[PDB]
Amino acid sequence: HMASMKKKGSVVIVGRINLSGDTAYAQQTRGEEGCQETSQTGRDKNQVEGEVQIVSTATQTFLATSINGVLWTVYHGAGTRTIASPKGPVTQMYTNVDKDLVGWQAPQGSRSLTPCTCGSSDLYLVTRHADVIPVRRRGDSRGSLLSPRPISYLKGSSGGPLLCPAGHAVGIFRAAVSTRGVAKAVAFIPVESLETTM
Ligand SMILES: COc1ccc2nc(C)c(O[C@@H]3C[C@H]4C(=O)N[C@]5(C(=O)NS(=O)(=O)C6(C)CC6)C[C@H]5/C=C\CCCCC[C@H](NC(=O)OC5CCCCC5)C(=O)N4C3)nc2c1
Numbered sequence: 001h002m003a004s005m006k007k008k009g010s011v012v013i014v015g016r017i018n019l020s021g022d023t024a025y026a027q028q029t030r031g032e033e034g035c036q037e038t039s040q041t042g043r044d045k046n047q048v049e050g051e052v053q054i055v056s057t058a059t060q061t062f063l064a065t066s067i068n069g070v071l072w073t074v075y076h077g078a079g080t081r082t083i084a085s086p087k088g089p090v091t092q093m094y095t096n097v098d099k100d101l102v103g104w105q106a107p108q109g110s111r112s113l114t115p116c117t118c119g120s121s122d123l124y125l126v127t128r129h130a131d132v133i134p135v136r137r138r139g140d141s142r143g144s145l146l147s148p149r150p151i152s153y154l155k156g157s158s159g160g161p162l163l164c165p166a167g168h169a170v171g172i173f174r175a176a177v178s179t180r181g182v183a184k185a186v187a188f189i190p191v192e193s194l195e196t197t198m
């Protein structure tokens with residue numbers, strides 16, 4: 001009944017993938033309990049840094065990537081949820097279920113990737129474990145792994161970036177193509193798809 005109907009919590013930033021120096025590595029900034037309370041209130045006072053955030057709901061964890069002042073992630077992770085912020089929950093400014101895409105204004109203190117204009121096909125996928133995985137672009141929204149690996153290694157990395165050799169954003173990781181549990185290829189939202197959404 002309506003008196004009892006509950007509301008879903010916000011997406012919460014719980015860490016980041018540090019790409020600052022010569023070594024990529026994941027950092028956790030909030031533990032599970034603090035994530036739970038922050039999801040309910042939507043008020044996140046934590047300092048945000050970097051381009052690739054690790055984000056969580058009450059039931060899922062995945063990635064979100066800042067490009068051109070928008071923090072982008074996948075609809076299958078975030079749904080229509082708000083994101084927690086110092087001032088309370090922030091409503092999505094982009095939602096496209098047809099592309100599996102959502103976006104919020106990039107949180108203050110984040111750094112944004114620049115959209116790639118290179119037209120290169122030698123890409124790099126960044127995972128939630130801070131692995132940098134070479135990917136050859138094979139189409140507008142897909143690329144093959146140069147070194148296949150079980151899908152277990154890619155789970156939780158949707159919303160992460162595919163980058164060009166110069167470090168620009170080429171796309172947002174959306175799905176994995178697997179055979180007998182081995183990921184041979186990935187699908188991603190191309191940055192041009194974001195650039196038109198913007
Ligand atoms: C609800 O409204 C929606 C609108 C649009 C929408 N659009 C897509 C494409 C979608 O796809 C599902 C979620 C994807 C996923 O799991 N994303 C990764 C991930 O990590 N998620 S995640 O962070 O763990 C999680 C779940 C958020 C917390 C990156 C995957 C890593 C490992 C794969 C595990 C086995 C799964 C293999 C799948 N393969 C595949 O679907 O291949 C395609 C591509 C070509 C065309 C047809 C087939 C696969 O990847 N997904 C299945 N759901 C929706 C839902």
Ligand SMILES: [Zn+2]
Nearest residue numbers: 116118164168
């Ligand atoms: Zn580029």
